[PDB]
Structure 1
Amino acid sequence: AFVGLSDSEEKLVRDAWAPIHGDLQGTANTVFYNYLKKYPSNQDKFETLKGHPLDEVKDTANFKLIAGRIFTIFDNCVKNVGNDKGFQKVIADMSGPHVARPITHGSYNDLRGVIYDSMHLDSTHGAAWNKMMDNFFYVFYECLDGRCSQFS
């Protein structure tokens, strides 16, 4: 279920995210590369990337756009961490294009973990981060299951 963050937890999340926020596209490029390299079955889900070696696409416009738009969503979730409806709406809006896609919970959760590992958070910040990400996945998966309207 969705579980709100305290004011103090919101601050922890903003602080945890600050290094990424200040280098959003650069972080996105690295994290998205590391994700596709560690979990190679996922590159095929991206039609613009499909059929080419990862090291050939990593430097391309198409690749950087995809990595950017993932991180722009998380950046907007963080922006909205103190507004549950606003946070939910960010997710609701990005969920529609994923609904029909053959992407497993495993794949999404693997990306969550690459992001986590990259942040090297202490346990206080990591706890707050995981509250937010648990909310993120709650909403996202509700929307993938066609129960997106409950957040409206």
Structure 2
Amino acid sequence: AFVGLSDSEEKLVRDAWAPIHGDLQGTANTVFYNYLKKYPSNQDKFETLKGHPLDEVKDTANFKLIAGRIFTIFDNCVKNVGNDKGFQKVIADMSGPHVARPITHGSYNDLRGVIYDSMHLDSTHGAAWNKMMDNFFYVFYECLDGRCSQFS
């Protein structure tokens, strides 16, 4: 279920994300590349990247736009870490286009893991981060399952 974060945990999340927030596009490009390189089956899910060698598409605007849009959502989630309804809305709106996409929870969770590994967080910030991410996926999966209105 959704579990609100304390004011202290909210600060921990903001601080944990700070490095990435300060280099959002750069981080996005690297993480997305590492994600598709470690879990190559996922490249085909992105119709614009499908059929090309990963090292070939990594430098294209298209690849960068995708990585950027993904991280922009996470950035806005962190922005709303202190407002559950707002946090939920960011995810609800983004969930729509994924509902009809043939993507497994494994794929989504693997991306979560690549992001976590890149942050190298200590356990205090990690706990707060995982609380926010658990909320992220609770909302995201509820929405993919057709139960997004509960957050309205």
TM-score with structure 2 length normalisation? 1.00
Q: Which consecutive unaligned segments of at least 5 residues does structure 2 have?
A: none
1:133 corresponds to: 133
| SS of residue matched to 2:17 | helix
Post-superposition CA distance 1:52-108 (Å, at most 9, x none): 000000000110000000000000000000000000000000000000000000000
| SS of residue matched to 1:81 | coil
Paired residues in the alignment total 152
Matches within 5 A, 1:1-152: 1-152=1-152
Query: By how many angstroms is 1:4 displaced?
Result: 0.2
| SS of residue matched to 1:28 | helix
Rounded to whole Å, the distance in 2 between the matches of 1:124 and 1:52 is: 41
Q: Which consecutive unaligned segments of at least 5 residues does structure 1 have?
A: none
Post-superposition CA distance 1:79-138 (Å, at most 9, x none): 000000000000000000000000000000000000000000000000000000000000
Rounded to whole Å, the distance in 1 between the matches of 2:28 and 2:61 is: 13
TM-score with structure 1 length normalisation? 1.00
Rounded to whole Å, the distance in 2 between the matches of 1:4 and 1:10 is: 9
Query: By how many angstroms is 1:151 displaced?
Result: 0.1
Percent same amino acid among aligned pairs? 100
Post-superposition CA distance 1:37-56 (Å, at most 9, x none): 00000000000000000000
Rounded to whole Å, the distance in 2 between the matches of 1:94 and 1:48 is: 19
